[PDB]
Amino acid sequence: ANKIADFELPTIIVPEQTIEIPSIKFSVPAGIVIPSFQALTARFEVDS
Amino acid sequence: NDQEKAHLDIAGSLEGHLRFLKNIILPVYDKSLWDFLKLDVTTSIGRRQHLRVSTAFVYTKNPNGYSFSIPVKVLADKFIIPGLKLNDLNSVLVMPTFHVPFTDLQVPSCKLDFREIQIYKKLRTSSFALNLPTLPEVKFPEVD
């Protein structure tokens, strides 16, 4: 800059920056579950 | 929907001032609506008419039900799953710790089990960083 216009640049300093890595959880099946039938119920009502 | 039970419930409520409709007579029968039906409440005069419909679907399930679970043996530093013990290949393989070139990452030592399945509960990652002349140098702390 001084080579061109005798004026020098203001100094810029970027300090140390902390960057966060959010936690991640991966689930792999350790077994299967088949729900056992216990009861099935259906109710229909018409009210007039 | 959950592990224990499933609920599907829908209800429809309608309200309408259909009083005038109820105020009708039948010349073919020569009878009134309320009279012919023989109903007065909401029919003789005609009232604010409601229609109510309910549908309830409910099913019961066991959260544990009929479950097939892999056999797992858990230790402080490892898990052991006794899979098929085939003798065709080498029983074990030991992996020494390795220093990755140009960085400080230390690969933790591990023992690989073929007859069983051996997992190590926690794996340790050594810290490492980039070496640059005044550039932003990322320094990585250890993570387990």
UniProtKB/Swiss-Prot annotation, chain A:
It is found in: Cytoplasm; Secreted; Lipid droplet. It comes from the Eukaryota. Induction: Up-regulated in response to enterovirus 71 (EV71) infection (at protein level). Palmitoylated; structural requirement for proper assembly of the hydrophobic core of the lipoprotein particle. Apolipoprotein B is a major protein constituent of chylomicrons (apo B-48), LDL (apo B-100) and VLDL (apo B-100). Apo B-100 functions as a recognition signal for the cellular binding and internalization of LDL particles by the apoB/E receptor. It is linked to Hypobetalipoproteinemia, familial, 1: A disorder of lipid metabolism characterized by less than 5th percentile age- and sex-specific levels of low density lipoproteins, and dietary fat malabsorption. Clinical presentation may vary from no symptoms to severe gastrointestinal and neurological dysfunction similar to abetalipoproteinemia. Hypercholesterolemia, familial, 2: A form of hypercholesterolemia, a disorder of lipoprotein metabolism characterized by elevated serum low-density lipoprotein (LDL) cholesterol levels, which result in excess deposition of cholesterol in tissues and leads to xanthelasma, xanthomas, accelerated atherosclerosis and increased risk of premature coronary heart disease. FHCL2 inheritance is autosomal dominant. Interacts with PCSK9. Interacts with MTTP. Interacts with AUP1. Interacts with CIDEB. This is Apolipoprotein B-100. It comes from Homo sapiens. The lineage of its organism: Eukaryota, Metazoa, Chordata, Craniata, Vertebrata. The gene is APOB. The chain holds residues 3844 to 3891 of 4563 of the full protein.
